[PDB]
Amino acid sequence: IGDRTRYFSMWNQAVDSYDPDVRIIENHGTEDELPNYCFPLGGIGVTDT
Amino acid sequence: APTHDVTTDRSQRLTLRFIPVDREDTAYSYKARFTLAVGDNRVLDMASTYFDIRGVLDRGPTFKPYSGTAYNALAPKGAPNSCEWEQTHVYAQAPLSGETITKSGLQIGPVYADPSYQPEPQIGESQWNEADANAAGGRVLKKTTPMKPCYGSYARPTNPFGGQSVLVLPKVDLQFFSNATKPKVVLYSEDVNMETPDTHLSYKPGKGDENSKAMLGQQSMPNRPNYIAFRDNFIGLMYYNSTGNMGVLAGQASQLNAVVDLQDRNTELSYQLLLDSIGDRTRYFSMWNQAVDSYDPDVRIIENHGTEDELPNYCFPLGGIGVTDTYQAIKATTWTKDETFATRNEIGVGNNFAMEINLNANLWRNFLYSNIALYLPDKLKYNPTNVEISDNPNTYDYMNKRVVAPGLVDCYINLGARWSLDYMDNVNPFNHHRNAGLRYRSMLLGNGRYVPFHIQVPQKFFAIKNLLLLPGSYTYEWNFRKDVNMVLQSSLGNDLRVDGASIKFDSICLYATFFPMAHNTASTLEAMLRNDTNDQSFNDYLSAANMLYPIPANATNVPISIPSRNWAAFRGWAFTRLKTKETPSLGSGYDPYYTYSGSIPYLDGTFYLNHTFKKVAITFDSSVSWPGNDRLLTPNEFEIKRSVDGEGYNVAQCNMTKDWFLVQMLANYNIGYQGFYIPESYKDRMYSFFRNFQPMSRQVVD
Amino acid sequence: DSITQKKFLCDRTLWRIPFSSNFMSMGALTDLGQNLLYANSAHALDMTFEVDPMDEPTLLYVLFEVFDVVRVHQPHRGVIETVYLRTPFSA
Amino acid sequence: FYLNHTFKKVAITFDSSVSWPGNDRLLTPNEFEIKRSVDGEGYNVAQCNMTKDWFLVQMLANYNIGYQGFYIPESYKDRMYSFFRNFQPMSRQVVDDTKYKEYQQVGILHQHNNSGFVGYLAPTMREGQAYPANVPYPLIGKTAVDSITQKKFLCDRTLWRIPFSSNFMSMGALTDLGQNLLYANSAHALDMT
Amino acid sequence: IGDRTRYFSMWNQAVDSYDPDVRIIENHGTEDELPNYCFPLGGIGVTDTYQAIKATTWTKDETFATRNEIGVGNNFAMEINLNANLW
Amino acid sequence: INLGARWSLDYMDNVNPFNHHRNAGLRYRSMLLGNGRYVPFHIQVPQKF
Amino acid sequence: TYFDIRGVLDRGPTFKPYSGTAYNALAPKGAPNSCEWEQ
C-alpha cells in the first residue's frame, strides 16, 4: 500500500537494504589514463647553488 | 475465481518446442523453416512465440570490457621491472632480506631460496624502519626478455608456486653483486613469457625494440575500453523490410504468404518507438536484450563548475617525519653529555617532509581526458612516434594508438559554463564506454571474448506479432544475419569484420505458449473469429514511408521532389539527419562497404544530429506554399533556428525560433495556444522533444 | 571583452510537422488528410531543407507519415488471407 | 530473504501417486525445475540457468504475464518483494583448466600483482619489488586463454510462488482449484520434495 | 500542478534547492581501511652502485658493468589517506 | 565532527541554505546566461497576476 | 502572452561561476614561479 523507499521515524520505518554494486560487482575497471603526481611544496625539489 | 469454461481439465502442454523442418546456412545468412502446428480447440497469441538460438561468438581481440589494466595498475606508468641489458647492465631491487649468501644463493633460514619461485617479488620487509640488510635477494629479468613498463606487465606462471621462468626446465641463473669481496646482493635472473595484453606504449625512446638504458623510461598506457555485444532488442539479427530475405507465414493449405514487406518500411525503429510508448525503457530485461542505448548527460554536455580544492592535500613519510639528525642528550651554563641517553638520537627539526597534490583537480582532469578527449574527432589527433600503427582508420589499433593532447579538453575548458564542445555535437554520443545499455548487454554475455550464447529473439513484424492464430498448420520461416557489423555492436564502432569478430549459429528452435483454454470455449472463440466481420487488424506503429536522401559533404541545400500523387489521409512529416557511414544498405542481404559497428540511428533511434537543421520550405504543385495562410512569423517556410542576425524571433534563451518551438510543442503535446509549460511526464517520453531539448550559452573572447 | 554564443541540442527525437490545420493532434486521420482538395485530385510536392554543412557524406531521413494497415482473415483451418493497405504512398 | 537461488527443483504429489499439476503441462511434467545445469541449457531462459517453465510460472503467479508474451510488468505491480524487480541473471568466463594446456593453479600465497606497491596478504605497508604480474589469466586479446562460461541468477527479498490455480493465474483470492469438489468432498495427503 | 524538479529555460523555471547532505551532515566516516601511497617514477627510488662478482674466493665479473644500480629493501614511498582528504 | 551522527550544525540551522554554490537551480540559471560577466540577454517573462 | 525582453547585463567582478582556479590548478599552493629579487 505504499512506497517503502521513504522513511518515517515515528514507526522506525526504514527498510533494510543493500548497495546493489556491493551485492553484484560490476568491474568496468578504472579511468586511469592520465598519470597523477604529488610535488615538492616549493615546486622544484632538488636545487643547486 | 470462475470454476467453469476457463481452463481445460484435459492433458495439454503449455509450451511447445518446434524443431526446424529445413535449415540453410549460407555465406552471410541463416534460413530456418518451421511447421507451426496449432491443434484443435486451441488458440495462439503470436506474441508468445520466439526463436530460441544457440551458437558461439568470438568477440575478437579488440574486445575490452573495461578501462585501465589488470596488471600492476598501481605501478608508476613509467617504472620498469628489475631488468638487464647489453651496452651487461642491471637495474633492480632486492626486497628480501637474508641471513647470508653463498654460492648456493640466499639463506632464507641451512635452507636457501628455491630459485624456481623464491624470492617471491611480492614479499619484502615488514616495517618502514628497517635496518639496512647485510644480505638481500630479489628477482630480475634477463636481457633476453623484452623490456616493458611494470604497469601492464604480465607473464603467465610456469609452476604451481607462481614462478614465471621459461621452461626448458626452470632456467634461473644466480648473479651475485658487491660494492673480502663477499656478496651483499643476489639476483635470481630468469626469462619470462612477457606480455602486455591490455596496454600499449604512450612513450618509446626510439625505434627498434632493443633493450637499453633508455628503454627504462618507456611509458605504458591502458588500451581504450571496447564493449562488444548484441544490440538492444536483438536489432539486426532478423531480416526485416528486405525483399530478397522476406519472412514467411503461410497456412499449409492456403500456400499464400501472409507476410508482405517493403524495403520502404522500418520495422526495427517502429518497434523501438512502440516499446517506449507502452513502457519505461530505463528498466532492463535480459530475455530480449532490452537495454536501451544511452549516454552520460555530463559527457554530452559538459558542466564545468570547477573543483572544490580549497584545502591542500599532502602525502607524508611512512615514519611521519622524514629527514632526521642524530643528537646527544646533555645536562646543565655548562652543559655535559647525559649518560642516561643513547649517544645517537633521531630528531627532526621543523615541519615534516611533504609532497603536495590537488586530488580534486586530478580526478576532474582524468574524467575529461577519458570521456571526452579520447573521443574527439580523429582530425584533432596525431600519430605516435616510434610505434607502429594500422593503416585502417576503421580499426581498433588505429583508434587505440592515435594520440590526443589532454590540453584540448583540460580542466579549465569553458569554465563556469554548461556547454557541449562544438567538436562533439556531431559525434555519435552512444558509441562510448559510458553507454549503460551497451555495457549491460556486453556483461550479460560475460567478460571474455569467447562466448557460447543462448538467446530468445522476438518477432517484431506488425502484421503477425500480436496475431491470434487459429487452429491449423502453418509454415513459419525467417532469415537471420551473420554479418558481425550488423548483429554485433561495439562502443568504439570499429570494423568487426576486419577486427576478427565472428559468430556461428548451432541450433535454432521455435517456442510457443498456449493458454490452456477450455475446449468448448476455444471452439466458440474460433467460430467467431473465422467470421470476416471479426477479422483482426493491425497497423505498424511508426506508420510511415521511409526515404533516405544523400547530402554530399559540405552541401547545405537539399531539395527533394515528389511526383504528382494522391495525398488523402496523409498524416504529416517527421525527419532527422544520418551519417552515411552509420547507415547500412538494407537494399541487400549484405553490404560490402559497411565498415562500422556502432549504434545505427536509422534502426535504433539513437538520433543526434537534429541541431544541424536551419529551415524547411514545403510547396504543393510548385506554387502553393504550405502551410501558408500567413500563419507563421516567417510565413513562407519553417525556420528551425536563426543566426544572431535575427535574435528577435528566438526563444527559450537559445537560437531556436518562436515558430519552431510552438510547432514542436503543439505537434508533440498540443501545448501552445493556451500557454507554454512542461508537459506531463507520461507524455514526455524518451524520444520526445521537450525531454531532449537542451539550450546552451557561453561567452568567448571577442 | 566577450562574445555570446547560443545553441541547442535535441538528441533521440524526430522533428515533426503534422499535416493538421492547427498542428494539433485531434485524431490519427488528420483534418487536412480528409480535405476534398487532397482527395479528388493529385498533387506534386517539393521540399527544400537547409542544413549546417558537415565535412562528410550524410543522409536526410524523411518519414512520410501515413497509414500502414493490414486486415487478417482466417476462414478455414490452416488458412490465412491478408489484405494490406498503405495510404498515401500505396505499395 | 537472500537464498532463493539455492533451489534446484520441487516435486508435488497428492495421495502418494497423483503428481501435481501433472496433465502434461510443463516441459518437464513431473516436477517444477527451477534451474538446470549446463547439461540442459536448452530449456533455460533470459540468458541464465533458470528454466523456461519456472520463469513462466513466476511471471504468471506474480503478474499474470506469460500466455500473451513476456514483458516488463507495470512498476506499480512490480514491488519491492516481487520476482522481476529482484531477478538478476549473470554470466562470466573463467579459464578452462582442462583445455588450456599452460594452466597452473596458483594459490593466493604465491599470486603477485602490484608487488612492491601493496602489502603481503594483508592491508599493511607496501613491500616487495615491481615485477610482471602472474594473475589474472587474460580472457581478452590475442593471447586470450581458453575459457568456460558460468551462468547464474540472484533473486533476493522475494518468495518463490506456486499458486493453486488451474492456469497459475490470479483470477480471484478463492482459487478455482480451491473450489474443486475433488478437494472439498474428501481429504488427501500431500508429499513435497 | 507540476513537478518542480524539471527545468524549463523559457521562464527561467529552475527551483532554488540545496544539497541535503550539506544541510544535514551525515558523518559515517571514511572507508580508509587500506593505505594509499605514491612512488618514485622509476619504481625504486634510492639505489646504490654494485659490481658483479663470481665464485669462497669471489672475483669481479668482467662480463658486467662496474656500476650497477640496485636498491635494497622496499622502495621509497610517501603515504596519503585519499578518502579522509576527499571528505 | 559529530562522527556517526545525522545532524545539522546548530550554527547552520538559521543560515539560509539556498545561498550556496550547490543550489542547483541558481547554478543552472546562471549557466543559462553563460560563463562570463558580460552578457547580452533575451528572455520571455510570464504574467503572474 | 508574455513580455519579450532584450538588454545587456554586467554581473560585475564578484561573479565567479566555479570553484577552484583556471590557472595552474595542479601546482602546490605555496610553490612560486621562477623569479628574482633584490636583497
Swiss-Prot record, chain E:
Induction: Expressed in the late phase of the viral replicative cycle.
Localization per record: Virion; Host nucleus
Cysteine-cysteine disulfides: none
Domain of life: Viruses
Its biological purpose: Major capsid protein that self-associates to form 240 hexon trimers, each in the shape of a hexagon, building most of the pseudo T=25 capsid. Assembled into trimeric units with the help of the chaperone shutoff protein. Transported by pre-protein VI to the nucleus where it associates with other structural proteins to form an empty capsid. Might be involved, through its interaction with host dyneins, in the intracellular microtubule-dependent transport of incoming viral capsid to the nucleus.
Record's subunit section: Homotrimer. Interacts with the capsid vertex protein; this interaction binds the peripentonal hexons to the neighboring penton base. Interacts with the hexon-linking protein; this interaction tethers the hexons surrounding the penton to those situated in the central plate of the facet. Interacts with the hexon-interlacing protein; this interaction lashes the hexons together. Interacts with pre-protein VI; this interaction probably allows nuclear import of hexon trimers and possibly pre-capsid assembly.
Family label: Belongs to the adenoviridae hexon protein family.
UniProt miscellaneous comment: All late proteins expressed from the major late promoter are produced by alternative splicing and alternative polyadenylation of the same gene giving rise to non-overlapping ORFs. A leader sequence is present in the N-terminus of all these mRNAs and is recognized by the viral shutoff protein to provide expression although conventional translation via ribosome scanning from the cap has been shut off in the host cell.
Protein name, as recorded: Hexon protein
Source species of the chain: Human adenovirus C serotype 2 (HAdV-2)
Swiss-Prot record, chain F:
Induction (record text): Expressed in the late phase of the viral replicative cycle.
Subcellular localization, as worded in the UniProt entry: Virion; Host nucleus
Misc note: All late proteins expressed from the major late promoter are produced by alternative splicing and alternative polyadenylation of the same gene giving rise to non-overlapping ORFs. A leader sequence is present in the N-terminus of all these mRNAs and is recognized by the viral shutoff protein to provide expression although conventional translation via ribosome scanning from the cap has been shut off in the host cell.
Protein family (similarity comment): Belongs to the adenoviridae hexon protein family.
Subunit (UniProt): Homotrimer. Interacts with the capsid vertex protein; this interaction binds the peripentonal hexons to the neighboring penton base. Interacts with the hexon-linking protein; this interaction tethers the hexons surrounding the penton to those situated in the central plate of the facet. Interacts with the hexon-interlacing protein; this interaction lashes the hexons together. Interacts with pre-protein VI; this interaction probably allows nuclear import of hexon trimers and possibly pre-capsid assembly.
Function (record text): Major capsid protein that self-associates to form 240 hexon trimers, each in the shape of a hexagon, building most of the pseudo T=25 capsid. Assembled into trimeric units with the help of the chaperone shutoff protein. Transported by pre-protein VI to the nucleus where it associates with other structural proteins to form an empty capsid. Might be involved, through its interaction with host dyneins, in the intracellular microtubule-dependent transport of incoming viral capsid to the nucleus.
Protein name: Hexon protein
Species of the source: Human adenovirus C serotype 2
From Swiss-Prot, chain G:
Transmembrane segments: none
Cellular compartments annotated: Virion; Host nucleus
Induction details: Expressed in the late phase of the viral replicative cycle.
Subunit record text: Homotrimer. Interacts with the capsid vertex protein; this interaction binds the peripentonal hexons to the neighboring penton base. Interacts with the hexon-linking protein; this interaction tethers the hexons surrounding the penton to those situated in the central plate of the facet. Interacts with the hexon-interlacing protein; this interaction lashes the hexons together. Interacts with pre-protein VI; this interaction probably allows nuclear import of hexon trimers and possibly pre-capsid assembly.
Miscellaneous field: All late proteins expressed from the major late promoter are produced by alternative splicing and alternative polyadenylation of the same gene giving rise to non-overlapping ORFs. A leader sequence is present in the N-terminus of all these mRNAs and is recognized by the viral shutoff protein to provide expression although conventional translation via ribosome scanning from the cap has been shut off in the host cell.
Family: Belongs to the adenoviridae hexon protein family.
Reported function: Major capsid protein that self-associates to form 240 hexon trimers, each in the shape of a hexagon, building most of the pseudo T=25 capsid. Assembled into trimeric units with the help of the chaperone shutoff protein. Transported by pre-protein VI to the nucleus where it associates with other structural proteins to form an empty capsid. Might be involved, through its interaction with host dyneins, in the intracellular microtubule-dependent transport of incoming viral capsid to the nucleus.
Name of the protein described by the UniProt record: Hexon protein
